[PDB]
Amino acid sequence: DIVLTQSPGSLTVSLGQRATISCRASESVDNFGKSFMHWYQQKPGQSPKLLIYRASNREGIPARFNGSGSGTDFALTINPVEADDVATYFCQQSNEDPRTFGGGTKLE
Amino acid sequence: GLFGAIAGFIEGGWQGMVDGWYGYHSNEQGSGYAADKESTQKAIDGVTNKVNSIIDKMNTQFEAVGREFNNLERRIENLNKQMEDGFLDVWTYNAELLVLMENERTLDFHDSNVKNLYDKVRLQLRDNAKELGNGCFEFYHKCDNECMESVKNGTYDYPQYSEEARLNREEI
Amino acid sequence: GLFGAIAGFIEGGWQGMVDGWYGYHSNEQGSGYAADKESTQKAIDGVTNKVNSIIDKMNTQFEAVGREFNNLERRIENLNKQMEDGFLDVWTYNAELLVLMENERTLDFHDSNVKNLYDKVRLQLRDNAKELGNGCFEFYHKCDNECMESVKNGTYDYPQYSEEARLNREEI
Amino acid sequence: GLFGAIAGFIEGGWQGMVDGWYGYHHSNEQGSGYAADKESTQKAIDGVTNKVNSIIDKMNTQFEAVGREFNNLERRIENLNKQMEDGFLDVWTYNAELLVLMENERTLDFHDSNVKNLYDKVRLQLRDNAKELGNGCFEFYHKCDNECMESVKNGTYDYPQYSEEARLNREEI
Amino acid sequence: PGDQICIGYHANNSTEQVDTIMEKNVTVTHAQDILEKTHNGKLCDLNGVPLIL
Numbered sequence: 001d002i003v004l005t006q007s008p009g010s011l012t013v014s015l016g017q018r019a020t021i022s023c024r025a026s027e028s029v030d031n032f033g034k035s036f037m038h039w040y041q042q043k044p045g046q047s048p049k050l051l052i053y054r055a056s057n058r059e060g061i062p063a064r065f066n067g068s069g070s071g072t073d074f075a076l077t078i079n080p081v082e083a084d085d086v087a088t089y090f091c092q093q094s095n096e097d098p099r100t101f102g103g104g105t106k107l108e
Numbered sequence: 109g110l111f112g113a114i115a116g117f118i119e120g121g122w123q124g125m126v127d128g129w130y131g132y133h134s135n136e137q138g139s140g141y142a143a144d145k146e147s148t149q150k151a152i153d154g155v156t157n158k159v160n161s162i163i164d165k166m167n168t169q170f171e172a173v174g175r176e177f178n179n180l181e182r183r184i185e186n187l188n189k190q191m192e193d194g195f196l197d198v199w200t201y202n203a204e205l206l207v208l209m210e211n212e213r214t215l216d217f218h219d220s221n222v223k224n225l226y227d228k229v230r231l232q233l234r235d236n237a238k239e240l241g242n243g244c245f246e247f248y249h250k251c252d253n254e255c256m257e258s259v260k261n262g263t264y265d266y267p268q269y270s271e272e273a274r275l276n277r278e279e280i
Numbered sequence: 281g282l283f284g285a286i287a288g289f290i291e292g293g294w295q296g297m298v299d300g301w302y303g304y305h306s307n308e309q310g311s312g313y314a315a316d317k318e319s320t321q322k323a324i325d326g327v328t329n330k331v332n333s334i335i336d337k338m339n340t341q342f343e344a345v346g347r348e349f350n351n352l353e354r355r356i357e358n359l360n361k362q363m364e365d366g367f368l369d370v371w372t373y374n375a376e377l378l379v380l381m382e383n384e385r386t387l388d389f390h391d392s393n394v395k396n397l398y399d400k401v402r403l404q405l406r407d408n409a410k411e412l413g414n415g416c417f418e419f420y421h422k423c424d425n426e427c428m429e430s431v432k433n434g435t436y437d438y439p440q441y442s443e444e445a446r447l448n449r450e451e452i
Numbered sequence: 453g454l455f456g457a458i459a460g461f462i463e464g465g466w467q468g469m470v471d472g473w474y475g476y477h478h479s480n481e482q483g484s485g486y487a488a489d490k491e492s493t494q495k496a497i498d499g500v501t502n503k504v505n506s507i508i509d510k511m512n513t514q515f516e517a518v519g520r521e522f523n524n525l526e527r528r529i530e531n532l533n534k535q536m537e538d539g540f541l542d543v544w545t546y547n548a549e550l551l552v553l554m555e556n557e558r559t560l561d562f563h564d565s566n567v568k569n570l571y572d573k574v575r576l577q578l579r580d581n582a583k584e585l586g587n588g589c590f591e592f593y594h595k596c597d598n599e600c601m602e603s604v605k606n607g608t609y610d611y612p613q614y615s616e617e618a619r620l621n622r623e624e625i
Numbered sequence: 626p627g628d629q630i631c632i633g634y635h636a637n638n639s640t641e642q643v644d645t646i647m648e649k650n651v652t653v654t655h656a657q658d659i660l661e662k663t664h665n666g667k668l669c670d671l672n673g674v675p676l677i678l
């Protein structure tokens with residue numbers, strides 16, 4: 001199992017600023033030269049949504065979302081933060097079964 | 109083959125020698141097969157480098173690319189096809205021929221390693237042994253296991269056995 | 281050549297042997313030439329397969345096609361020309377080189393067949409004959425026509441003549 | 453090598469022989485010294501020189517790249533043209549590299565063969581008039597003065613002239 | 626009657642054949658195949674990344 005640990009657990013950021021959510025993998029999630037990390041957005045009261053695939057590229061997703069990172073640690077950067085960004089954000093790896101997700105980070 | 113040894117003056121290989129390609133005895137202490145580690149390793153290195161060299165020389169080979177053309181580009185379509193087939197045919201020839209040529213040299217290479225091994229022993233034994241003419245030398249003296257080992261590792265002391273050999277030649 | 285036989289230790293070929301490439305006698309019953317059918321047929325098969333293999337490897341060669349272009353297609357006209365000449369030059373090199381390389385191997389192949397034939401006889405005769413050093417072995421015993429035939433077909437009974445040979449060596 | 457002579461039964465070359473590739477070292481009462489076999493050396497020189505000249509000759513009809521320009525809507529033939537140029541450049545680079553590798557190997561074995569032939573040239577002359585030491589050297593069963601040494605070197609050894617004194621020296625042994 | 630030593634070479638139960646200029650189908654003790662002839666008959670993802678129209 002590749003344990004994924006997101007940090008911080010809850011993040012409150014001022015409107016129009018920068019949210020910076022981190023992910024840390026127990027072992028690397030990074031071969032073939034690409035990172036097999038994914039970011040997901042769960043706006044409250046509905047199913048999760050796909051933001052970033054293989055750690056850097058956006059899926060109809062605004063540029064405000066910066067997927068970054070390589071290897072063992074990554075980061076979803078939301079900047080500028082808008083109103084409709086309240087959600088819990090999840091990182092999940094596909095590098096190696098069993099597919100594992102992060103704890104998740106709630107944004108306020 | 110080219111050098112007259114493999115399937116030549118040595119008519120047949122030994123199922124019995126299994127720890128190598130080329131090798132060697134029969135005395136009072138008993139008989140048995142043994143591989144010449146040195147000549148075997150040399151051949152292994154040579155063939156392995158050969159195989160690796162063939163695969164290496166082919167890394168800059170042609171790689172076909174998908175290209176599309178319309179009904180009024182039939183000429184360059186055909187040119188493009190001839191170009192692709194052109195290189196595919198060249199490189200297929202190059203791979204096929206290289207394999208055929210180096211195969212032939214490889215078989216003769218083994219033949220040569222064997223003929224050299226036979227000569228290595230022959231040039232040591234000289235008149236201290238008789239050439240049976242089948243890859244075997246019949247000794248004119250007593251060759252114990254340690255003596256057998258000296259012939260096999262190129263440290264035969266010819267003059268040590270010279271006298272007892274000469275005496276045994278002359279009652280014959 | 282590579283193997284020291286043809287135009288080597290055997291200095292010259294025989295206009296007299298006409299039924300083959302390689303062959304052999306002179307006794308009391310009389311002298312004459314004879315071809316070694318076996319080694320000759322082997323060489324014929326080898327060279328014939330070689331010739332047929334060379335012609336075979338060339339069936340997927342480039343074939344130039346007429347193509348026309350106008351005054352504003354000078355670039356692809358030239359590209360097309362370079363492509364055609366390009367392959368024509370490659371395949372001309374391939375044919376010329378292949379012929380040069382296999383010619384050299386063929387001459388050395390014959391040299392090797394001869395040197396092997398000489399060794400075939402030598403390894404049979406051993407001390408029952410003297411190496412004159414010109415491709416000829418002078419016998420230490422009487423070799424009638426049937427004996428000559430046994431040397432030629434690899435059935436020489438060395439020990440049968442061993443004693444009369446040994447006796448003739450020692451008054452010398 | 454292929455023929456067992458160079459770095460084979462003759463284990464090592466001579467820094468001392470400098471006037472040629474292959475030759476002799478003699479040793480008699482008049483004294484010792486190195487000498488090159490002019491004939492076999494010249495043959496090899498001619499062979500290798502023709503080989504080098506043949507390799508350079510076979511390459512005169514090689515591909516020569518030409519500058520050609522294309523615009524933004526000619527990307528296809530631009531690429532075709534590039535593939536064609538690289539295509540031939542890669543073929544001819546293979547041809548030059550391989551030819552050199554193959555003929556190098558044959559050249560080393562060619563020298564090996566010239567040596568083994570030279571040794572055999574002497575051996576077939578001396579026969580039982582000398583003993584094969586097995587290291588490229590023949591120990592004579594008779595007296596070989598400088599003129600005799602010269603006859604072995606130029607292929608005019610008179611075997612029967614020394615036959616008797618050789619045979620007598622073999623038999624007290 | 627006398628002690629002897631023999632020079633010889635390996636042989637086995639191999640049926641692998643190989644080709645040369647002068648001879649075809651030469652049974653040999655060891656050979657290496659260098660031509661891949663099988664595929665999975667499927668279109669697949671390439672190193673964790675296709676657009677199928």
Ligand SMILES: *[C@@H]1O[C@H](CO)[C@@H](O)[C@H](O)[C@H]1NC(C)=O
Pocket residue numbers: 649650
């Ligand atoms: C080589 O063997 C194969 C089958 O094992 C067969 O396709 C063919 O007839 C053979 N050809 C020759 C020339 O031996």
